[PDB]
Every structure is written in C-alpha cells, then in structure tokens.
Symmetry: C5
Subunit: 310 residues, 5 copies
Amino acid sequence: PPPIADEPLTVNTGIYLIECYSLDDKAETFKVNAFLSLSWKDRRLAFDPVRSGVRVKTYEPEAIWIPEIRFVNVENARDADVVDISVSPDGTVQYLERFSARVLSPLDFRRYPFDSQTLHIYLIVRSVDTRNIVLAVDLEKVGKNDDVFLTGWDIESFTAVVKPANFALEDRLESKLDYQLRISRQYFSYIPNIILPMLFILFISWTAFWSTSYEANVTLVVSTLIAHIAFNILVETNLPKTPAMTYTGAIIFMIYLFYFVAVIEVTVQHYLKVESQPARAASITRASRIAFPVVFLLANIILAFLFFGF
Amino acid sequence: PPPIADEPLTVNTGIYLIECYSLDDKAETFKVNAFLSLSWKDRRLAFDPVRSGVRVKTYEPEAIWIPEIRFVNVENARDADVVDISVSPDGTVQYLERFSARVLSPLDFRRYPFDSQTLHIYLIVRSVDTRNIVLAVDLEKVGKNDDVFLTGWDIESFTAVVKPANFALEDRLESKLDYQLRISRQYFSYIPNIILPMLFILFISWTAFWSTSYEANVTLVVSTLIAHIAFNILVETNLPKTPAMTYTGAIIFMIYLFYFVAVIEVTVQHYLKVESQPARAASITRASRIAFPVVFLLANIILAFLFFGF
Amino acid sequence: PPPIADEPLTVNTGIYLIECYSLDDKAETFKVNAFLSLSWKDRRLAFDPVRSGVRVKTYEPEAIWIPEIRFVNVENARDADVVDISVSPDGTVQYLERFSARVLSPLDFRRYPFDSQTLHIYLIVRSVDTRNIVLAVDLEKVGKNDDVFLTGWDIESFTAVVKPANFALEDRLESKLDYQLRISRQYFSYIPNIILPMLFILFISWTAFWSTSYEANVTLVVSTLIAHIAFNILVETNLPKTPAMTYTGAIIFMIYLFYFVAVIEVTVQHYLKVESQPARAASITRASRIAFPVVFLLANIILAFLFFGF
Amino acid sequence: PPPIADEPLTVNTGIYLIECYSLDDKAETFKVNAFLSLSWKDRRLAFDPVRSGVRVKTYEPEAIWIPEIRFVNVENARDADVVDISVSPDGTVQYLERFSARVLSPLDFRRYPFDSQTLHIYLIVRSVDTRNIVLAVDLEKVGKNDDVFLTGWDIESFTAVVKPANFALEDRLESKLDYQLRISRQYFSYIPNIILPMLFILFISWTAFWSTSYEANVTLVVSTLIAHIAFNILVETNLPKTPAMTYTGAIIFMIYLFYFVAVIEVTVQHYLKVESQPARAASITRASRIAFPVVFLLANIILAFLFFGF
Amino acid sequence: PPPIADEPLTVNTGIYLIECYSLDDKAETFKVNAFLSLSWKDRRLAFDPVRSGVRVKTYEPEAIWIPEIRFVNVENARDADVVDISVSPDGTVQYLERFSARVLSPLDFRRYPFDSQTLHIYLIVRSVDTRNIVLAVDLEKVGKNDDVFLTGWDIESFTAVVKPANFALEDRLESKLDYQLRISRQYFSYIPNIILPMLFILFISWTAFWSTSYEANVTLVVSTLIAHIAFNILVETNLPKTPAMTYTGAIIFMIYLFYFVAVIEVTVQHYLKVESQPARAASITRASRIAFPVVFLLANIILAFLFFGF
Ligand SMILES: [Cl-]
Ligand SMILES: [Cl-]
Ligand SMILES: [Cl-]
Ligand SMILES: [Cl-]
Ligand SMILES: [Cl-]
Ligand code: NA
Ligand code: NA
Ligand code: NA
Ligand code: NA
Ligand code: NA
C-alpha cells in the first residue's frame, strides 16, 4: 500500500557503523555491524496530535508501508533487526534497524603494504507505481562510533556520495547510494618482520664475492636461496594473492633474480679461475662487490617510484 | 491451485547476476547473488482495469499459485527473498525474487593457468496435472551488472541456452534450463610469480655442467632440488588438485625428471673421471651444456602443443 | 492421526541423487542433494473420483498424516523441502521432497590411492501404535542423475539393499533401510604427481654407491633425505590421516628405512676405508648397487601383494 | 502449568548415542547425535483407559507441561527434534526427542598418543515452584548403538553417574546429571608414521661419531637437524597444542637437546684435534658412540616411567 | 506498550557464564555461553496475591513488554532462548534467558606469551518515550560457573563496571554496560617448546667461532639459519599476527640480526686470514666467543625490561 502523490518518493537514508570487523584479504570481504536509518513522507498516516494526544506515534513494521531498501554488494541475507519505527504528525516516518552483513568490496593490492583501501556499501531501491529515489541524511550518516577499529588499519573516514545513481533495470527505475569506508594500512610492523630479514638473507648471499672457494660459494648462494624460500613460506600469510602486478611482488621477483645472477657470477669466477685467467675472475668478483648492492639500490628506487611516484 | 487450459504451461525465466564471488577452485563451487524473474499466464486471476481502476494488480506470494522453480546444482536451500509479484489484466503474472546461492559446477584444469571455465546454473521445474515447461526471456536474462567481477578472471559473457531439456523423471515430465557464465583466467601475474623463479632454480641446477668438482656438483644439483621442492611448497596454493592430467602438472613433473637426469649426469662425469677416462667425462659435460636447455625447450614446445594445439 | 488396520504399515521409499559433492576425506563425510520419495496406504482419506471429479487429490503437508522418516547418519537437521504430496483414490499417498544433507559414512584408506569406497545413507522410522516398516521401491530408487560426479572418483552404482533391518529400540520397533553409493578412485594422476618423484629422489640417494667420497656421500644421502621430507610435506594434502595401517603409509615408511640403511652403508664404507680394508669397503658398495634396488623391488612386490592379493 | 504435589518432581532421563563424530582435538569438542528420553509423573493428565478406550494417550508438545531440561557444556542451541510424547494412564509421561549437538569437554593430552579420554555430557534442570530433580533410567541410558565409532579411537563405554548434583544457583535449586563417554586412542599407526622416522633421523645424526672429518660432521649433524625440523613440520598435524607438559612433547624436546650436545661434541673433537691432542678427541668420540644411545635409552625409560608409572 | 512513570526506567542486568570457549587469537573473538538476567518495574501488571492466589505470576514473552536489551560487540544474531519470565506482585519483572554468542573484543599481543587479556561484553539499550537506563545487579552478575575454562588460560575474574555509559545516539539516549572477563596466559609450556630450541639452534650457529675452516663456518652459520627458519615455520601457529610491535617479535628479529652479524664475522675472519693477517682474524673470533653471548644477554635484558619494566 505505497504512499501516493504527484512527485517521486524520496527516502532519506543513513548508516552508522557500530562495529566493523573481519577484513578478509582473500575473499575481499569485510563484516560490518551498523544502524540503517530510513525516513520518508507518507501523508496517508499523517495524524492529529491533539485528538490523539501524542506528539509521535509508533507502529509495528507489519502495520505500515516500509520501502524495500536493499544492499547490493552483500553476500547473504542481512541480519535485519528493527529497533524503532515512529511517525511524526505530518506523515514523515522515521525507521531505524540494527543490521550486520559481510560486504563484498574489491581490494587493490598494488601498493601493499603501504596501500590504502576504500570499501563500499551500496544501497538500491526498486520502483513500484510511484517513482522511488534514495538520498543521504548526513546527521544520521556520520557512521563512525569512536570505538570502531580494523586491526592493522587506520580508519580514515566514513562518508556517502550524496548524488544517487538512478537507472533503468528490467523495465523499472532503480536508485542506488554508495557509502564509502576509507582506510590505510598500518605498515610499520612489516619492516622488522618481513623486509629486513629478507634483506639480511640476501646480503648473506652477497658475502660470496669476498670468497674464492667455489664450494664455499655454491654452498653460500644456494643455501641462502633455500633460506629465502623458507622465509618466504614463513611470511606467506602476509603476502595476499592477486592476478595484478603487485609492488611487493615486484621486489620479491627481483630478489629471485639477484639470487640467479649471483649464481651466474660465482660460476663465472670459478670458470675463469679454472681456465687460468685469475685476473678476470677476481676483477669480476671485486667489481660485483660494488655492483650488486648498487644495482639493487637503483632497481629498488626505480621500482618504488614506478609504483608510487607514477 | 494451478492454472488450467488445453496447453502446456510455459514459464518465462530470467537471471540477473548482481554479484558473483567466491570461485572456490577446490570445491568446484562459486557463490552468486542474482535476480530470478518468472512470468506465466494465469487467466483465473485475469481482471478488469476499469472496474478495478488499476493497470496492474500486485499480490502477496501466499495469495496465488507460483510455480515450483528450483535450482539443480545448488548446494543448499537458496536464500529466497521475494521483491515483487504483479499481475497484468490478461492474467500474465510477473514475479521477481532476489536470491543468492553457491552453485556447483565442475571446473576443467587441464590448461591451467591459461584455462577458461564455463560455470553453469541449472533450473528445473516438475509437472503437476498440467504439463509444465520453462523457457528463457532474454530481456530479463541479460544478467551481468556492469560491476560483476571474479578477481583473477575476465568475465566473458552471461547467456542461457534457449532450448529447455525435457524428460521423464519418476513418472512426471520435467523441464530444465541451463544458464552459462563463461570466464577466462588472468594468467599474467603468474609469469613473474611462479614460472620464472622455477626456471631460475632449474638453471642454477644446470650450472653444474661447467664444474668438475663432484662435491660442488652434488651440493649444486641436490641443493637446487631442495630449493625446488621448497618453492613448490610456496606456490602450492596456486596449483589446484585434480585426478586429471594437468599441463602445469606435466611441466612440473618434467622438471623433477630434469633434476634426476642431471644427478645421473654429474654421477657419470665423476665415475668416468674416477676411472681415468677424463675425455669421455668432460665430453659428456660439455655436451650436456647444450643438451639440457635444448631438450627442455623441445619438451616444453611439444608439451605446450600437446595441450593447446591438440 | 496414523492410518489404522490389522497389518504393519509399509512405507515405500526411494532416493534420487540429483547432485553429490564434497567428499571430505578428513571428516569422512560427503554432501548429497536428492529426492526422497515416500508412499504408503491411508484408507482414511481414500476418496471418490466421480463425486470429487478428479483422478488425483493433492494435500498440504499439515493437512494429513506423514510418517516420521528420518536419516540416521546425518550430521545436521536436513534441508527438507516438500515438492509434492498427492493422494490416489484408494488412499495410497505419494510424497516427494527435495533434500540435501551431509552424510557421515566411514571410509577405508588401506588400499589408497587404489581404494574404493561404499558410502551409506541409512533411513529409520520409529513405530507408533501401528507397527511401522519401510521398504524400497526400485523405480524411484534408481537415484543417479546422469550428471552426478565426485571429482577424482568414478561413481559405480547407486542401489539399496531391499531387506529392512527391524529391531527393538527403547521399547518400540524400528525399521531401517541402507542405501549404498559405490565409488572407486581415479588414481592415475598420482603416478606423475606423487610416486615417480619420490622414487626419483630415492634413486638420487642411491647414487652414493658409485662414490667413495665420504663428504659427497653424506651430503648426497642426507640432502636427499631433506628433499624427501620436503616433498612429503608438499603432497601432505593427498595423504589422509588414519589410525589404520595404510598401504601407501607402508611404502613411505619403507622409504625412510631405505634412507636409514643407506646412511649406515655409507658410514660402513667410510669406516672400512679408514681402517685400511678398502677391499671390504668397495665390495660392500659394489654389492649395494645391486642390493638396494633389488630388495626394494622385492619389498614393494611383497607389500603390494600383502595389501591387494590378500 | 507444572505438576503439583507434596514431593520434589523426579525426572527420569536417558541418552542413546546413535552416532558420535568429529572429535576436534583443537577446540576440545566433539559432535554427538542421540536420543534424549525424559519421563516424569503428572497426575493432572492421568486418565481412564476404559472411558477413553486406549491404553496410552499421545500429546503434541505444545499441549502439556514438559520440563526444561538443558545441556550445560553445549556450544550452540541444540538441534531439538521431538519424536514421541506418550502418557500412561497413571500420569507418567514418556518423552523422546532426537537431538544433535557439539559438546565441549576438556581433553588431557599428557600421555598422548597412548592417552585415553573421558568426554562428558552434562544435563541441568532449574526449579520452578516445585523443587525439581533429575535421575538416570538405565534401560534407556544404554546409549551405544553397535555402529558408533570415533575413527582412531576405541569406544570403551557409555554410562551415567546415577547421583545428581544439586545446588543453589541464583536463588533456585538446580539438578545436574553427568553422562560419560570413555575412549582410548588407537596409537599403533604412530609407530611406523611418527616415532620410527624421528628415531632414524636422530641415528643418522649419531653417525658423526665414527667420522673425524669436521666438515662431514657439521654437514651431518646440522643437516639432520634441518631434516628433523622438516619432519616435525610434516607431522605437525598429529601433535596437538597444550599449555600442559606433554609426554611426547618431552621426548621431542629431549631430541632437540641431543642435537645440541652432538653439535657440542663434534665441536670439541674438532677443537682437540686442532690443538694437537688427538688422543682426547678420538677418545671422546669413541666414548660418545656408546654414551649417546645409552643416555637416550635411559632418558627415555625415565621419561616413560615418569609419565606412566607415576 | 512500555511502563509509564515520572522517572527513567532502570533495568537491572546480570550475566552468568556457563561456558566460555574458542578464544580465536586471529579474529580476536571468543564464544560465550551464558545467562542473561533482566529485571525492571512495571506497575501496569502489578497484581493481588490474595485475589489471584499465587505469590508469583509467570507470563509468556509475547504477553508483556520486555526491554530491547542488545549486545554491541557481537558478530551475529545471538542464540536467544528464554528460560523464565516471572512477575512479583508489586510489578517487578524478573526475566532470564540462556544465550550464546561469539563476542568481538580486541586482544593486545605486545607481551605475548606472558600477556594477559581483558575481554569485554557490552550491553546497550535504546530509549523509547520513557528514558531508559541499565544497571548491574551483582547477585546475578557473579557469572563464573566453577567449571569455566579457556584452555591455555587462567580465568582471573568476571565482573561488571557498575556505572553505565549514557549518551546521545541518533536523537535518543542510550545506556551501555561493560562486563569484563579478565584472563592471563599459561606460558610455561612455551619454554620447552619454543624458546629453548630457538636458543639451541642459535648456539649451534655460535659454534663457528671456535672453527677456522671457512667452509665449515659457512655451512655452520647458513645451515643453522635454514634450521631457524624451518623451526619458525614449525611454531608459526603460536606466533599470532599483529600490526603492533610485539615483544616475541622483537627477540625473533634480534635473532635474525645475530645470524647476520655472525655471517659478517665469519666472512671477516676468512678475509683477514686470506690477506695474511691471521692475528687480527683469530683475535676477532676469540673475541666474538665472548661478545656474541654477552651482547645477546644484554640485548635480551634491555628488551625484556623495555616491554615489561616500562
Ligand atoms: Cl674451490
Ligand atoms: Cl671432486
Ligand atoms: Cl673423503
Ligand atoms: Cl676435516
Ligand atoms: Cl678454509
Ligand atoms: Na604457511
Ligand atoms: Na602451503
Ligand atoms: Na601441505
Ligand atoms: Na602442517
Ligand atoms: Na604451520
């Protein structure tokens, strides 16, 4: 029994995150636990304060027409839980439900660890006989409770883009709001825990340049390579999968490449030494001692700028 | 209380994916979140626009006969959620539910990474006293929302094969539509991340051909073999299980075989050198230096053609 | 309000697997998605075709007495979903529900990979005042849809043992049918993927018999042992846990035993060589070169016959 | 509407395990699938066999007063499913529900693998105006179906301690029965699969005592130590976590300690040999050859007795 | 139909943990299974003991007004299960439900293993036309059953902070109680299982200081480094992820740093020895033998005090 008039029905909306949690990097989902606040005008149940004796009149949800607002990027039926429905005398209705749902928003991992994400929560409504359109009421959208937290993330801001998207969909108009939760990662624990030790085991690999012992060198470079793979396995949890070209993935690939050309160098130095041209051998090792750290430092700087300064 | 007439009842159907997600390579399932749109003629509730005063008359689902359309390859009861039921005056009924369900469709991994899949969603309906038959209405089947995504996949097309399958089943006719979601994988991140490093550790194993030191060689080939297994463990996540003969599984098996015959070679060179026939030894190593990369490049080319050009 | 007469009430039953899936080797469960078809005589609602005008009369499940058929080995409340209830005029009732449940049936892993399993689905019904007994109707038990699949398994047959088990249980008779889904494993992908590489790394271990260098030998045998454990970790996914004495577990244990006695041999050859009896040393190695592969081939043949030919 | 009389209301209880499954060593839970059988006297619905014409009168659960029996150590709302309620003429009521629930009972891992556990299922009931007390009826408690199984466990016995615990709780009497499922582990598969290979890799470590080559020895002892950690990783699944001092944890710790003092020994032998006192070196190695296996055998015997004979 | 009077409505509350379980270090959640006890005055259903004949009058939850108390930090709809509602003659109502819910409370890992946590359970209630305020009744808050246990934790105390938080929220007053479950970890099993073996493999690394053999030394230090990473992988389960600067993470990082500077030392000793200044080489090794254990002991002491004494 929808409200009837000469104009499209506007439904004011607001979201208020009480809790947000479980940012699943793998499934690209995150659970949320919030207030939904709908408000719209329905003159059909507008009433008299004086004859009825009360400034505001509450109703059970079965009793009156409540618009079919629905989340779009939500993986399951939401845990709907009505908290209040109250009608002002002019027929404005104010509805407030608590809800929780796991939301599906894509994450972009290219600048990880130093990435930042912008999670989305969409809301559609579909038209009936009246055209129907949603819009944001900011006093009730200021959705962050002060206690909200994503462990490992700084929660920058919770806002909504005020202009609804409206479009044809299976021969009816539909209106869609985009709420946005913006976050940036807490990278620094990674420096002690991931980047420094990989660099250490890489440096141990470079020690072989001051050795001339081919068996000491192969044992050196290849055993460090095993250590490197083992350690990569150790931190495999903090290196989420993408089809995309990640930054960290880049520097890691580059490290495998350094293990490779170090093996090539050790082999060349041993071949030259075996062919009785010790001069070229020890010149190539003595040169490598500068070359490897430097080309690394350059390749890191290029690769850093290429992802961040671009 | 089914509609009654002289003809089999046709039910027009349409699906509209709002979101699809969670392509679980292991379980061969994928979750989907879509519109179902049923439409069929029921003259029994056909009505007069003029006496009733309205062009279209809505009904609650309890009120009227709605056909038992059911998914076939769905792992659980679907999260049904009716959005609209409306009746046109001639008695055509148009029904629209939102639903989400994890769908079970087999995946074929033989050409992985470069595979493509064609996920299915089946729809049966079972006959009552009237014969009952489903058919696709394309204006409401054009199921992709522009925002649909499977991370790591390009979503090619969403279509339905218009001819229903109809068949006897426990002494009743049944009608079955096959909707098809076609996808191809985003392989390229694999090149930096999986194939190149395996090839590097394999090349490091081939370095042993320029060495004559048996201890340097065993340490070389066997330590690279450990590194190889470690690395295979590292990417174990991106190498899904099959009973079938995979392409990537083929090249991997072939790599183990190369580690084996390299060990055989190193051993032969050392045995020959120990038996005072250094000429045959260093001839076999000097030969290996060409043979190994080449037979590899051939064996890869054969193996590639065998899976792709066949 | 149960049907009343002078005889035990027979309930005809049938199962029709639409889908089966998720054979969880760990939990020894497997999900199934099928038709249940109950049929039984109730003269109390037998009726007149002519006065009522219809050959068959449908009823909602609340309206009439439907026997409490229940699965036994099912881990949760089943997803019951009634599809049809129809009454023939003599009072025979034909009931058909779609259902899905994860079923608990033990698996026997002793001959794995080459095992075969026989999953079970039991059905009990408990007596009221009438004695109650189930029995199978084969036309509705032929439960395989042609599309049914367990990835990695050939689905041999779906049948039911026609004689019910009937027994006292807490002072009432109970009747129990046993449906049986028989399957055999798709082993062959394992040969390239598990058994050949383990054999290769074992052969690399045997290379040490042609070496006399004690450091080359320890590095050889012990580094292959690390590789072996690493590789076992790699395929740990395809080696399911049992309290029972597995065949594959046997050959694996035997491989560890071969690494051990190879270490013992290498040590003996080195001790003999150190005590100035080179003849006994090189005789023991030269002997080992035949002994190890042979005793292996024997021990595998015995072990194979012991599990399969017994 | 509770039964009223001059005495505390006794409720006879019985449990009948139809299936038990999913002994989760980690969560210390286990799922169970059984009969609950309640029986109690209610004269208010006692009735006349002759005027009513029937020996026993069934009732729907809504119709009459059924005591609030509740499980204590159960992690979720139980899957309640009433099977029968029947009233004898004197007013004794016999109630029988099927149920399944995952139960939380602590496990004691100190003697693992050879441990045995005693899982619990508690039942409380809370008093109303009548005092209320539970007690066990053994004919309906004999809860094992012959088919019950916990893979990897022998199921010793299912019994209940007949004396209820009764106590004040928030100003009301409460009665609590403790049913007990006793089990002992199937250890033997562990001998081939865990303990023997660890012992082998440890013995390989002791081989170094017959070597004087320091590089051979460090490669020996340290490479076996890597193998040991790898293998411990391989069986990490069968070594469940505790805050408590496990037996298997003890022997494992002791093994690490043996790797350590073997490294210390190899180092001392090399230091003595380097300081031109070969006599003390080879005396210490020759002594170690006996000492290590022996102190191990003693330390294992002490440790075994300390956990089992204590 | 809320109670009406001149004062804000107080609702007395109490929680009684029957069981608590599943402390998930990763998700920072923990399941709980408890009593909720609400009590509040409603004169509208106050009644006469003498005319009605009973001291206390029970009601079904549908019958009367029960306040919307709701958990805040709970991840799903709670498994509500009403046990009793009883009304005293003056109109005080006493309500008691059993419930279970997984609770979301952050954990602080900085002092792990030796950490202690303080889990929270919040309770809000939102105002209607009457102002509404919660407060704790201690006789019914004493929530620990004697049997409660978190394996690996000592359960210190269960209490509630008696002063409610009250605040504006979307134009209504809200009241919020904070129950607190305090716990401290059972660390000691970690000493045999994690810290001692890491220290052992580190000491093995220090053995290299008494060796002058560069190949023995590289094999020593780098192979212990592989062992260290392997072992870290082995205990990866007991080292939970944080964005924060953990203590155990600190000592682990410091251990990687010791492997690094030990490699640097071994390299320096070999370079000095190669440049014909053996005096400086063996002086640096002989110095290292004291330096490494000492700086370690200091750095551990500083690090310990920095986390604990600060
Ligand atoms: Cl050399
Ligand atoms: Cl050599
Ligand atoms: Cl030698
Ligand atoms: Cl030596
Ligand atoms: Cl040296
Ligand atoms: Na891992
Ligand atoms: Na893995
Ligand atoms: Na694995
Ligand atoms: Na593991
Ligand atoms: Na692990």
